[PDB]
Amino acid sequence: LKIKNILLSGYPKQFLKLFDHKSLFELSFKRNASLVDETLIVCNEKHYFLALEEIKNEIKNKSVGFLLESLSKNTANAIALSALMSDKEDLLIVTPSDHLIKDLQAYENAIKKAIDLAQKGFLVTFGVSIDKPNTEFGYIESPNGLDVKRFIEKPSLDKAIEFQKSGGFYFNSGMFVFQAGVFLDELKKHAPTILKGCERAFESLENAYFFEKKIARLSEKSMQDLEDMSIDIALMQQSHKIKMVELNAKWSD
């Protein structure tokens, strides 16, 4: 089984080389590239050459591809597109680029766990233990740290303080692992018209083999009619196939 890193990036903040000569983007790239067979970087077409510049050192025999965006129609669309650019059978490690993770061994452990659950046919999410209850995040209810009772993305500040006292609540990391095929099957079930829109958008995809790297982008036309929606709203609030793995690695956002 092939394993793909889907590096979600789409002068933005994650490109600034502030963290000891290095950027969040190249840190996020480097951390997952070691665990994976191919990377697919999804970013805005404006920043392609910025992105490609920052990982010029890091491509050591690595098979790296890009999906360039004219418009950004949020994570549900970026993920569904990436899955459609994949073999049904291969496994997807979906990782936002604006992440700081310092304990790399605790990261690597959680990944190998998530992979195992993904082969069982699950959509794997990652929990981070709440300290400061802010309402911009997704909330995973998990009493036992593995089964999720429900997903509530962006609750009211009443609910965020109520689930503070309750215990067994984690911040959704925004990272994800799943097989491409089961992801697309779950999307068919729960957001059928979002899968539909991505399926026809994918039809008008074209490649740019110049720039040396093989690139793919979609026309502004194709992406226009797409509903702007999050994976958390589209799928994670409705999927019956969700497990969690704890991230104890000094995760920052």
Q: The domain that contains 128 carries what CATH number?
A: 3.90.550.10
Contact present, 80 and 184 (Cβ < 8 Å): yes
57: DSSP letter? T
- Three-point CA angle 70, 73, 74, nearest 5°: 125
Domain, as residue range, for 200: 1-253
Q: To what resolution in angstroms was this structure determined?
A: 2.3
* Main-chain phi, psi angles of 70, to 5 degrees: -75, -60
Contact present, 163 and 178 (Cβ < 8 Å): no
Give the list of residues 6+ apart from residue 242 with CB closer than 8 angstroms, or none: 122, 123, 124, 125, 148, 151, 236
For the chain, the residues before each gap (C–N > 2.5 Å) are 10
Give the list of residues 6+ apart from residue 99 with CB closer than 8 angstroms, or none: 24, 27, 28, 173, 174, 175, 251, 252, 253
The count of structural domains within the chain is: 1
